[PDB]
Amino acid sequence: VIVLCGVALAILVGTASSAACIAKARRDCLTPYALAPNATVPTALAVLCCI
Amino acid sequence: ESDKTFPIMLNGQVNGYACVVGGRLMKPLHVEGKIDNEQLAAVKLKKASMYDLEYGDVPQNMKSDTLQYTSDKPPGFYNWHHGAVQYENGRFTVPRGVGGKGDSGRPILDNRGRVVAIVLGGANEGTRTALSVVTWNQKGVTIKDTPEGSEPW
Amino acid sequence: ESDKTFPIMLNGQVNGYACVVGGRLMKPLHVEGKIDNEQLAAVKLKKASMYDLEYGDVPQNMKSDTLQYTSDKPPGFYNWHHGAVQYENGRFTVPRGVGGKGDSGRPILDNRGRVVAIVLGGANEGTRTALSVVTWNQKGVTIKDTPEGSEPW
Amino acid sequence: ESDKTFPIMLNGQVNGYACVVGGRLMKPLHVEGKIDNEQLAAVKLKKASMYDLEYGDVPQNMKSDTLQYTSDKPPGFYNWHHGAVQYENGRFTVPRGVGGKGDSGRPILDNRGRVVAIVLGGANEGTRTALSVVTWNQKGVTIKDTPEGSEPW
């Protein structure tokens, strides 16, 4: 039971960290273009991190 | 300037001057207070802390009345609520002692009534005062330009 | 008119008008917004949903400061904030084009200054525009007169 | 007077006045209402119930400009919002009829622009009206005066 719970906790924390890092990268790479007109953004970053 | 630049109020004091540009409001993050306009008080402010700013979408009524972004900034004199500002060597400077706290968010103006930079702070270099501001770029990038010793008003 | 007719605020825009008649305050139900008067903001409204209206008892200071109603309706021209309205064939009509959304709750006046009806909407026949309003009757009966194709303004 | 004397408002009606004297804000206890001023609304009011008053330290940005007080009370006529008050026999008499509800908290001024007392109410003596006020004293003392039949305004 301890081993399975530890595996679940490790998966949960890894996913949470990845989500936080992705959202911070989206913020960082998008907020300069959101404060300006004509956002000629290479759409790979948005398409990757929109979902 | 007067028509579309709404002070932020707090404790009976003005702490800055929020500006609506291109259909979006901008307000310096370091400053605190309330916006006098009830409509702007109902906007959700997304914070870009790396630029020391938050932004939100202006309502449908106010969309037509906003200042204009710009990109081209020849060095020289530019308009300002307290007068004229000198742009040189990729740096904005003002006569020493003009401006201060409570003046954050003031837009630097161009001749055609277009916004060039937003005042965040000022650094005193003895002879003049260097403005820490956020500027645009030819690729449409809002660069926050802050000289050494800048103090966020 | 100007003193006793009040604006309704919707996100800071006018979207209708509330009329004070005989010490009671009416407001269209389809129009949603806040009354500009703080006193009227404290009036509880009970809704006659089939008449698309809500009425409330105005406080004691403005019970005297109110529009006077009337019931005599000879056919002909009657006063209106946007000009003249024609009462003909038991129908209220205006030149086709004047009036629209946000004009709901506008009072229709008599020449002596009394109120005859309150506008709720309009339908265009092409030649003129027929107004869906509320009209009073000789028996003291208020009919919500809505021509076919009436659209609430 | 006009700059530094603040109405007290309740339900959209002015029902009282608060005054700033000597770097401190005071207000009639009997009256209920907000104070429109942000800092005064944010001031903590210590309530002296037998004095029928609450006092609060005025903030620093306006403590510099506050009403001056006095203890010396030579007899004679004294100017006030609705004219002049006659001071005699340790009593503030005013012509009969003058004043009523909502005038509480109005300062009584000196000819040299100094505050001497605050009115709380009035009682018609017949040809005049005796003011119940809060006088001061030469020994650094403040005395409430409530003429028999004093009516809280």
TrEMBL record, chain A:
Sequence intervals crossing the membrane: 1-23
Taxon lineage: Viruses, Riboviria, Orthornavirae, Kitrinoviricota, Alsuviricetes
Subcellular location(s) per record: Host cell membrane; Host cytoplasm; Host nucleus; Virion membrane
Protein name: Structural polyprotein
Subunit structure: The precursor of protein E3/E2 and E1 form a heterodimer shortly after synthesis.
